[PDB]
Amino acid sequence: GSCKYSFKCVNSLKEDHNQPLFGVQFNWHSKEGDPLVFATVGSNRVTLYECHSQGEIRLLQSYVDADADENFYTCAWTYDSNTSHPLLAVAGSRGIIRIINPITMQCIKHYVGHGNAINELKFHPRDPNLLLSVSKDHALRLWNIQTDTLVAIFGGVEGHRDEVLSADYDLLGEKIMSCGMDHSLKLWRINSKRMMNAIKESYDYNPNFISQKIHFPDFSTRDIHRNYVDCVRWLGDLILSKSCENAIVCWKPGKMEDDIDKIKPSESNVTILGRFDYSQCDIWYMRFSMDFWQKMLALGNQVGKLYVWDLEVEDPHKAKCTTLTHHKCGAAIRQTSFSRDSSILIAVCDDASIWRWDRLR
Amino acid sequence: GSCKYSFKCVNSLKEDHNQPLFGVQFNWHSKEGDPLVFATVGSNRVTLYECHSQGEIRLLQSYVDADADENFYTCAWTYDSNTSHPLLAVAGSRGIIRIINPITMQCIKHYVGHGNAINELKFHPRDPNLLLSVSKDHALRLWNIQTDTLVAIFGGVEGHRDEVLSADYDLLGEKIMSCGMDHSLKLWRINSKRMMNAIKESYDYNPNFISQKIHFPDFSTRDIHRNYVDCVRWLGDLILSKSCENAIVCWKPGKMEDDIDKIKPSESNVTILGRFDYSQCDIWYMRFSMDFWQKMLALGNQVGKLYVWDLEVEDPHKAKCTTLTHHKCGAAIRQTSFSRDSSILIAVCDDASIWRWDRL
Amino acid sequence: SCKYSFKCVNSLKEDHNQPLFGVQFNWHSKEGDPLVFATVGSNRVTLYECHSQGEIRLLQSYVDADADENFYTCAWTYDSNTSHPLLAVAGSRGIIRIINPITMQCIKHYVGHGNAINELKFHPRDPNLLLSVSKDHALRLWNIQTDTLVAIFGGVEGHRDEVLSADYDLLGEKIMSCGMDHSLKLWRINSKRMMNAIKESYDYNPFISQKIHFPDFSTRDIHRNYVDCVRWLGDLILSKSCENAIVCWKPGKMEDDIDKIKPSESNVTILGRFDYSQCDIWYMRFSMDFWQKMLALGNQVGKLYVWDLEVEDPHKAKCTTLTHHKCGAAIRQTSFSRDSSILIAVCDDASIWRWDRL
Amino acid sequence: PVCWRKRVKSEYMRLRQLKRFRRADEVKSMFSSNRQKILERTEILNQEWKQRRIQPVHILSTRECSVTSDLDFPTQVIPLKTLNAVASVPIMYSWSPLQQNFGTFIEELIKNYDCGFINDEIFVELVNALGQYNSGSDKIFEAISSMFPDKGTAEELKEKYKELTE
Amino acid sequence: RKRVKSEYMRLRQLKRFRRADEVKSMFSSNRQKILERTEILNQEWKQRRIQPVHILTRECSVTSDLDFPTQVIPLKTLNAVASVPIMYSWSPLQQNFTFIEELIKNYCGFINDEIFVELVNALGQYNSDKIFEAISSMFPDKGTAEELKEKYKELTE
Amino acid sequence: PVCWRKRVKSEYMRLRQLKRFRRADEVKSMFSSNRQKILERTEILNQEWKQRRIQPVHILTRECSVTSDLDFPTQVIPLKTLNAVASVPIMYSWSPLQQNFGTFIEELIKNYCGFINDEIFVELVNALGQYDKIFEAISSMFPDKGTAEELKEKYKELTE
């Protein structure tokens, strides 16, 4: 039946470059009482905004890459444990990771390892120094940004056979699920003793380091989608993933009864629980999102419509979303982001516009 | 020489698919006092709207074809003699006809058989069960949607030699004029004894059926336009038809003195009365409209402007038209539709936008 | 900051939905008469009158009979015999038309050129002298009083590709052209050869056209791609290209006088650069006001940059950015009114934007 | 000389202008006689419409659709009814000088297909559930084979039921 | 060796400062050259009294985003520009070189037999062999003068 | 005849809907079991978040603008340019025996013969005359002008 979350559009902005904005991330690390700030990435630009009452969106900071042919695709927030400074990582076509310190307004760290473009960046949910990058070069990479070392390279003989498009840690940060253009979804456990020893020795390194080459994932499947898989996220111990077939598939490794932590790498079974159906999202690199509490699912389509599903109902795959639409919003929505308290939902588009949707209570 | 009709833009809608809307048709069968409703076709979607006071357009019903690759090009209203239900026929790129019943909200009939896509649907002005479908296969076909039979196929050795883009019955439903991509305009009479007996045997049919192929039209001409003809309508015993040359030509078969019903098929003469001139409408598949009383003629151009002519003036071909424009209306207008009382004029565009013009 | 600030008081849209390439205020208006400007786009010429409260009144508009014609530029002048204003327009098919807005008729045609005309300029001192720069690598100077072609600038050492722009100096003694061969070229028209050609252009009565093969200065070391706009800044040169900068330069060394520069001159001096962004597409022209105190250029995403040319270090000074949420089309040309009160911008979507100085 | 050539232009322009006037007068009467026919014929159509009383279209009640408006009017959302797919008829044609040559339940199986349409567990439950009706016991297996031919013929399903029940 | 590094940046800032001052005074000298010559043009402009432009079936429209209403004015069509029908010959010895227009605009087919006889009869009201030479001079496609004269005699009977 | 296939159609869909019910029940239970894992683990991360005190972000030659469709005015702030990243040049050689592989000259190439005039070359040597050893400094910093004693052949020639 009807979904319970309702939103009102209270503002819409437009950046002066008129190039597609691919990514948008709210800073979930801000303390209670500080204003909600989010970042957008598109073209060779990084922009930071501050949300206020009555739909007001204050523009705080903007950055340009010296390289005009740089094209940022994604970003991810984190913090410095020693200095309590928020940090923002950005990356894109040139395959270079940049860490920007909005407090000092400097760019503090560059990482230039990958063989090609970076498609997604994700920070470990328990260790703010461990940064995961998925790339066009068929591999994933786990960086320690406090020691400036590369902990592991997730790829090789049984890794992805084409571009890696997305990945996501589980809630407690024990395992990673990746996907890409080889139709596959692969599981990499980072709570194995090899990985656990690699992380700590990466912390113990000081110059007078070799990274751990993980060839075999702890699970793999091509049997969820029939095309490229361009976005994956964990839903507890189940998986949400999507392709160009106008559906988000909710599945789990193995048969219905199987524990995620006892799935052996040999597992040839998967179980489809259901599909979140929608329409007009068949172009590539359109990413869905969830709020912190993983109670809402948001996805934009290629003609400016914004779908929000309630994830807490008994049959989320059988319940209607609420479509958020505006007469002046017609450009493809590349990514959305909820504030930590789910009060605000921001959507960025291919025409460099920004749309603020405020939850009605 | 201003045009006496003037309109005000009172609403502008936009469907969520952002695909070109190719057809719009008011339901003229609605009885007096009932609200004015209209239908739009575009993408694989069909949508019924209701017009209300102060420019409000209520969204009533909407349908999607299960086939994701279907693209409806045209629609047409009719009614059921027995149940008094209005019916809506839709068709497009996949060459199938659907009859949708908005009272029960279900698709009650499929008609599959055309060689290819259907570019226009038209219903007989006296018989609600007689449906005309013109297609990419160079032919026209007349269906009896009561007994579900194909009455006749118009085309063949002297039919159209390329796609058929439009057709129209005369006011009393005695003849059909069709046009297409072969530069031709052909007249098919259905009040001949051969056709009237085909319509009768279609009705007296019960399975417990041969359709007649008409190879020769009762008139044909290529000497009106120099390119494809993409819209034709009757104006009494006269004909209005247009092409990409930015004019609607008003003409008639034979010479000036010749009666329409005495024209015999060998006629090599035509007579151009005048032309309704406009600008910036040189793309293909742009269709002009008329109200029920045939007092107004409306056509939209490819950059959002909407021309309206008063057909009842002394010199209709030499008279200024009313140009309806709006600052935020810049998409090609594919089709227009007057309400039966001609109080409202609806235009649908290539960006899935719907524009409401109320007369003053 | 920058000293001049503007307010967007109106936004129009012509019904053809075709790129408007040129806009020119009529600076020949006498003091007191309302400010009038003209636009060119598709096969259309349109004239407007600016008023109070942001109002812009539509006065006249013309369609070329030829549907394949595409006007690129226009230029105002006057008939000193009748003091009627005149507007010259040209474009894709390379024909110059002279429109009389008082008699609302096209009075003169000139069909000399080989291909399209990219820019039209009138002599600042002699209203009858019209300069056309064209796709056939040449500049032509016409005398529209006696309908004679005075000179053809180009040939053995002219431009080796399309000429995209040119400009008279303030007093009208010399011409500076630029084009797709990467090069800017100086053509002195105060030469005694050219002076005698202009005099006999008037003395002719029922013709000898002078072919100037060599310029009086040439450089290809300012920009590394097509130069698509050039304007004099006194004795200095302003010229841009697809590298997102208007470069202010001068022929010779720093102390070298412009009127002593020999054709042999192998040096140039680049004083500074007006830097902007997102203007790398071709045929985007910049403008100045009559008093040459402001510099305006629109970009391909709807933003309009205005510079103060009178400050200490203009090349190092910040500019005023005029941006509107509904303006995202490429601005093809701007135009100040004579008193610099109004700045008009035309865009690839047939839109017109009025900016009023505060 | 030149003077006759100017009167030729004079008299020709006059003769054509007269014939323009002649035909202009013709189409004016063509339009006026024609509108009288439109007037009477549309009145016939209208008098027939005033006899009928066709019912009005109503909005009478997981995919939806939305329509937005530039004006004061709110966004409208209504459910999207899906039109039933049209059946492709599998025509096959044979040609030879001598001759020429040419329900609900099986499409039920095809579209909610998530062994051969029926598995061993449901097959045994089906055989057992059908023993109530009826002494052949073969008529059951012949019918199950008739509707599920992919699982086997009648004698095959009988053998498999005995295998699975041992 | 780090004083070569700072003696160099010492010296290049010395010449960066000197050239910065050079263009500073270049712009200043140039500005007054602008100031003198623009007022030479402006005082020539004040001596002139140029007339103002005023408001004038094909129409045109200009819409506005703001509360100003749509404007409609007619669209004057500029007269068609004549394509000159050129010809050029070459030799080592040498190199050689309105009524008709609207006849073609309004279009054997030019003048038909019925209006041809009306044209001859009309011209005969002025006074006939000069008449046929004038007609063929105007309509050469219909035939030469003698052809036209028996063309008329054939149709008269 | 036709009655038997009537019976198996009804009995089949009876048994088929019973097993769709059963699988619908299992996915229902899977979601609700999974939901308590989400609830438990998201509050672990939420309690960890309440312990930290992260600083807030604050506002600001090239500028950027952000316009709004609504009544909010246009916002302008300066654009900070990010320092370029250097992908170092890597020359790698392979043998079945082997495998082979400060700021001032970066600034030297940016503000741009030999990188140094002869008018500033001799102004540089006399600037350092204040303080053979002199010209091995200049040539290692400015190699293109020549070697160390090409550079005092250099200075002897323009001095005279």
Side-chain angles (χ1 to χ4, degrees), chain B residues 232-249:
Chain B
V232 55
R233 304 280 187 272
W234 287 91
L235 190 63
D237 296 345
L238 274 38
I239 295 115
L240 300 164
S241 63
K242 73 168 276 291
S243 182
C244 65
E245 285 129 23
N246 272 298
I248 293 169
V249 177

Side-chain angles (χ1 to χ4, degrees), chain E residues 109-120:
Chain E
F110 271 159
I111 195 173
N112 54 92
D113 283 41
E114 279 85 340
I115 291 82
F116 160 69
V117 311
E118 296 178 350
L119 179 62
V120 180

Side-chain angles (χ1 to χ4, degrees), chain A residues 21-34:
Chain A
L21 290 166
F22 291 113
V24 53
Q25 296 297 341
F26 260 107
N27 181 14
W28 289 359
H29 295 290
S30 65
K31 57 181 176 275
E32 182 107 327
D34 278 1

Side-chain angles (χ1 to χ4, degrees), chain B residues 7-46:
Chain B
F7 297 80
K8 195 181 251 153
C9 187
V10 298
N11 206 348
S12 152
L13 298 179
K14 180 177 306 215
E15 311 188 346
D16 58 7
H17 48 91
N18 296 1
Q19 301 297 117
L21 289 168
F22 290 111
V24 59
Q25 293 290 333
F26 265 99
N27 175 15
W28 284 357
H29 298 287
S30 78
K31 73 189 140 86
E32 191 185 300
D34 282 357
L36 304 151
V37 316
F38 66 93
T40 60
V41 283
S43 193
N44 61 337
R45 217 161 293 198
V46 190

Side-chain angles (χ1 to χ4, degrees), chain B residues 57 61 98 235 272 294, chain D residues 23 34-35 58 76 84:
Chain B
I57 304 173
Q61 305 180 0
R98 282 178 183 265
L235 190 63
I272 299 266
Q294 294 203 19
Chain D
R23 180 132 172 294
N34 189 57
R35 183 137 286 305
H58 294 120
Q76 298 189 68
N84 43 86

